[PDB]
Curated annotation (Swiss-Prot), chains A, B:
UniProtKB keywords: Acetylation, Aminoacyl-tRNA synthetase, ATP-binding, Cell projection, Charcot-Marie-Tooth disease, Cytoplasm, Disease variant, Hydrolase, Ligase, Mitochondrion, Neurodegeneration, Neuropathy, Nucleotide-binding, Phosphoprotein, Protein biosynthesis, Secreted, Transferase, Transit peptide
Binding site for glycine: 182, 233, 379-381
Record bears the keyword Magnesium: no
Role, per record: Catalyzes the ATP-dependent ligation of glycine to the 3'-end of its cognate tRNA, via the formation of an aminoacyl-adenylate intermediate (Gly-AMP). Also produces diadenosine tetraphosphate (Ap4A), a universal pleiotropic signaling molecule needed for cell regulation pathways, by direct condensation of 2 ATPs. Thereby, may play a special role in Ap4A homeostasis.
Further remarks about this protein from its record: Human GlyRS uses direct ATP condensation to synthesize Ap4A, a unique amino acid-independent mechanism, in contrast to the classical amino acid-dependent mechanism for synthesis of Ap4A by a tRNA synthetase, that involves the generation of an enzyme-bound aminoacyl-AMP which is then attacked by ATP to form Ap4A.
Effect in UniProt of substituting residue 193 to Q: Found in a patient with growth retardation, microcephaly, thinning of the corpus callosum, decreased white matter and brain stem involvement, as well as large calvaria, cerebellar vermis atrophy, dysmorphic features, prominent epicanthal folds, hypotelorism, high-arched palate, delayed motor milestones, apnea and sparse thin scalp hair; likely pathogenic; reduces to less than 1% aminoacylation activity
EC number(s) given by UniProt: 6.1.1.14, 2.7.7.-
Lineage: Eukaryota, Metazoa, Chordata, Craniata, Vertebrata
Modified-residue entries (Phosphoserine), positions: 503
This protein's GO CC annotations: axon; cytoplasm; cytosol; extracellular exosome; mitochondrial matrix; mitochondrion; secretory granule
Protein encoded by which gene: GARS1
Protein name in UniProt: Glycine--tRNA ligase
Length: 530, 530
């Protein structure tokens, strides 16, 4: 239970993100990222960089965003990629059908005039909605009778609005095109030279961190439903017969909630299995697909998301994307309900065969006499955009003080800046002290900023606290007069401070940030400080 | 004098960059970046990050790429942003007028049937071409008589083809739009909250590193003329009366070539002045504008560009961009002729007033009773795309060996990876040696890779050399048998190797890379090694 009001405010006011073209109304689905937003956004992508590109030796490439029609035609996006959009025959007013109807019953079932009878099946319609194809979706629009959420007029019938953007490369129009809704298409169109790198063998994974434009229909969800976002997609290319990952055991232990395709049509709550097990019972197919799920879960933990509001729901027989057959998602419970943050498909051999075909060009690899195979790609797609947002809710807190102060609890690995050094007075009796302390941290690799904004030591930290800043070091007179020189080490969450000598602090904020010492351990080694 | 053939090849073959949608023909102006390309591209942006955002405390923000018409209408892009495009009335075939004509005379003057007479003025037409407005450009198309470079048909008349891309945000078309051809527009539309950060004072600079789409007409220049590129733009906001930079003295010494607006209409060669001087004589207006020129020059040096093929040419009275009045460029001499890599405008108060107007919203700052001013922005725009390319030529070399090997000479600060450790045999008598050496480097922060590709120690380095890899460490038997254990330290450029004990090497590759020791100094401290 989080409070959107007080956060969307604290966020926007502290310029994490805010509506683009503000001074023009602001196009919905389009938001900009201020400084502390960028600092956070870069720290999330710099972690995601270790966690994957580093650890698993991932081949990186930066592909163009401007795509020519033929390429998206072959993948079959020009076709099946879109959302059902209706609209009241009064004025234009669009609406992603899907959701509109999902809001109708969420009004009936919630209204107390419901029959313990009805209520139980409208749930059976919601939990089966992404499945409903063109027809059933057209029908249901008659039944429950849908009518514009604003001034209830009469919505036309459900239609397939393609989400891709559209433009022409070069002058004229002989070369129409689109704005790549996903990155991968590029990782594949490059397959040959990407195979090349890994000596022609498999497994070998590729990747890309960049933009993807998705002209949504009714962007009303804030940072969750945007028309342009930064996402990172990995294209793990493994043998169709070797679907057995050489590391899986490092992530089988993990006990993550799972909500199989059966635990859905078999209307039952998700379970908190184990991975080494969930794969046993035939649920999570092979092991590769389970390993990435393990990592995907560690990253999401490491960056902020909390164990409790994260689950993995496989799709439904035809809730499938046009390019896959199997597939799992990382859904994060939030004020908008469970939403996916890290889609993880299993698009067997689709994409690669479709392209090799249409271009009459050969796309294969070989194994040991030596047979040719079409690798089976397993794509773990991350939408940093939403991943950041989940981190914002899961860590938002309101300190218990009538004052109404707020502090985010970001892991030291993503906070705008780890430590925030602050002295009382700004004279030369403090400088030769503050100076050192900054460089000494610099050396230790503890990202920081020296506090200048005036206010009581305590009001100063209210600011440091709002943007999640991990730790703080208070440098008062006693640090500049008493000898040894002791400073104040304050843990953002507990506002509890420590008093340690000043030249030892940098190595302390370090061990603290890296997860090489608890806050409790400090209170135990050094003296407290109310 | 560089050789495009042998490089465009070595580049593309080593997947630095290559045509996008290869297996489809490849849309010109659109290229992708392979791994060693990305590694280089990221190292250039990570340097540019220190050099500017770090040093000058630059406020960063990440703005959207999708822009709604009204915003680009107010800046006046919907109007004056474009290139003159003709086309032979036979078939479509476009052509940026500008250049087509510039290729015609570059054929007349070069053809030996020229009069020492004519030749001298066609130069007077080329050196004054960006100036020629709609008319004179229409006229000259009659004179010199321009006719399609391919199957000389008859080109229509010169017209204003707007370069911006075009699309509709949301379903319908009630909200048309474009793909931001530059970033800044965003930095301005955010002015208010950006002022806020710096306590409402000036100077204070903003910035953005991201994409910009520029639907060129005849992308035929490779990586130099692309339809989509990553660029970084800084928006330094200083007082219209304080145009005097608080650091300029740190960059006045520098002796960089300058080619004033007068040294152009006064048809005379560029000069190799000094900055503290060039500003004296009234050429380079104030000092801010000169400081950034100093930095802009250091970065371009630090990353690769060579002093000699870099100059700064101010624009011509009406070669101006629609948003500026004064302006300098960083042109880099290359196989395509001097081309600009780092545009540096002085767009006084244009952009900010235009927006504050159209939106009826107030955009100002105050100084000490306390008057309101419209800061004067000074924009240093970097096109990493072309900056990378200049680095590719300026450092391409062919080792003197009939064999035809090539090695780039990237400053250790941008090479795919600094050191490249390589052992002969792959057994356990080498591991406990290679292992250490990697971590020991890891600790020292010397990005590296262990050589696996088979071949003679020497053929191995041919590879390390092609992608510019800074240094190499050869680990042979004598390192694993003789004691002390000595390795081989090889300097990419001179192929000259050193023999030093192995546990001391990591700190050596370090000092070497950081510019804290010459290669000569090694040959002096340690023993050689043919
Ligand atoms: N029977 C059927 N036939 C055809 N289509 C059917 C169908 N049933 C359901 N559908 C679905 O309806 C469409 C709705 O798409 P979307 O509008 O993109 O939203 P989504 O389904 O909630 O995310 P998705 O799961 O598609 O993300 P993706 O794999 O592309 O890529 C990964 C995601 O990218 C990011 N992302 C996607 N959209 C985003 C947005 N608008 N804002 C921010 N991030 C976004 C997410 O963070 C990340 O998880 C889907 O394309 C299609 O699968
Ligand atoms: N009288 C007149 N009236 C109106 N317009 C006139 C004119 N006389 C000349 N012109 C010029 O004609 C147009 C040609 O533009 P472009 O097609 O973008 O090429 P340019 O002039 O060589 O680069 P420019 O100097 O414009 O780069 P910019 O400041 O935008 O931004 C910085 C640059 O971005 C990068 N960049 C720009 N285009 C690139 C491309 N196609 N590929 C790669 N990088 C590019 C460069 O690296 C970097 O220096 C210019 O917009 C306009 O000024």
């Amino acid at each position: 239970i989080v409070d959107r009001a007080k956060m969307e405010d604290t966020l926007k006011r502290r310029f994490f993100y805010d509506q683009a073209f503000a001074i023009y109304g602001g196009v919905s689905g389009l938001y900009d990222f201020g400084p502390v937003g960028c600092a956070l956004k870069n720290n999330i992508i710099q972690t995601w960089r270790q966690h994957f590109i580093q650890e698993e030796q991932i081949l990186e490439i930066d592909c163009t965003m401007l795509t020519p029609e033929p390429v998206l035609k072959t993948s079959g996006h020009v076709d099946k990629f879109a959302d059902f959009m209706v609209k009241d025959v009064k004025n234009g007013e669009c609406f992603r059908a899907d959701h509109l109807l999902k809001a109708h019953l969420q009004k009936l079932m919630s209204d107390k005039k419901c029959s313990v009878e009805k209520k139980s099946e409208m749930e059976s319609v919601l939990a089966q909605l992404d499945n409903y194809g063109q027809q059933e979706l057209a029908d249901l629009f008659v039944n429950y009778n849908v009518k514009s959420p604003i001034t209830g007029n009469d919505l036309s019938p459900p239609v397939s609005f393609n989400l891709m953007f559209k433009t022409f490369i070069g002058p004229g129009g002989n070369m129409p095109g689109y704005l790549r809704p996903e990155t991968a298409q590029g990782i594949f169109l490059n397959f040959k030279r990407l195979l090349e790198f890994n000596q022609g063998k498999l497994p070998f994974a590729a990747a890309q961190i960049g933009n993807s434009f998705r002209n949504e229909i009714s962007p009303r969800s804030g940072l969750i439903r945007v028309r342009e976002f930064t996402m990172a997609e990995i294209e793990h290319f493994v043998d169709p017969s070797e679907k057995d990952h050489p590391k899986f055991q490092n992530v089988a232990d993990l006990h993550l909630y799972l909500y199989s395709a059966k635990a859905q049509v078999s209307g039952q709550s998700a379970r908190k299995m184990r991975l080494g097990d969930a794969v046993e019972q035939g649920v999570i197919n092979n092991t590769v697909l389970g390993y990435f799920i393990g990592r995907i879960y560690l990253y999401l933990t490491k960056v902020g998301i909390s164990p409790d509001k994260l689950r993995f729901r496989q799709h439904m027989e035809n809730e499938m994307a046009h390019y896959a057959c199997d597939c799992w998602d990382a859904e994060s419970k939030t004020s908008y309900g469970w939403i996916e943050i890290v889609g993880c498909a299993d698009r067997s051999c689709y994409d690669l065969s479709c392209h090799a075909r249409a271009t009459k060009v050969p796309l294969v690899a070989e194994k040991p006499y030596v047979e040719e195979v079409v690798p089976n790609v397993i794509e773990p797609s991350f939408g940093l955009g939403r991943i950041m947002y989940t981190v914002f809710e899961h860590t938002f807190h309101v300190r218990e003080g009538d004052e109404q102060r707020t502090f985010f609890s970001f892991p030291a690995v993503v906070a705008p800046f780890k430590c925030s050094v602050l002295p009382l007075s700004q004279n030369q009796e403090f400088m030769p002290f503050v100076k050192e302390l900054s460089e000494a941290l610099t050396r230790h690799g503890v990202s920081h900023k020296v506090d200048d904004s005036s206010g009581s030591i305590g009001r100063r930290y209210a600011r440091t606290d709002e943007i999640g800043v991990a730790f703080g070091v208070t440098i008062d007179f006693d640090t500049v007069n008493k000898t040894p020189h002791t400073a104040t080490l304050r843990d953002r969450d507990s506002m509890r401070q420590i008093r340690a000598e000043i030249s030892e602090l940098p190595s302390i904020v370090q061990d603290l940030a890296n997860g090489n010492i608890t806050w409790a351990d400090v209170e135990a080694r050094y003296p407290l400080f109310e």
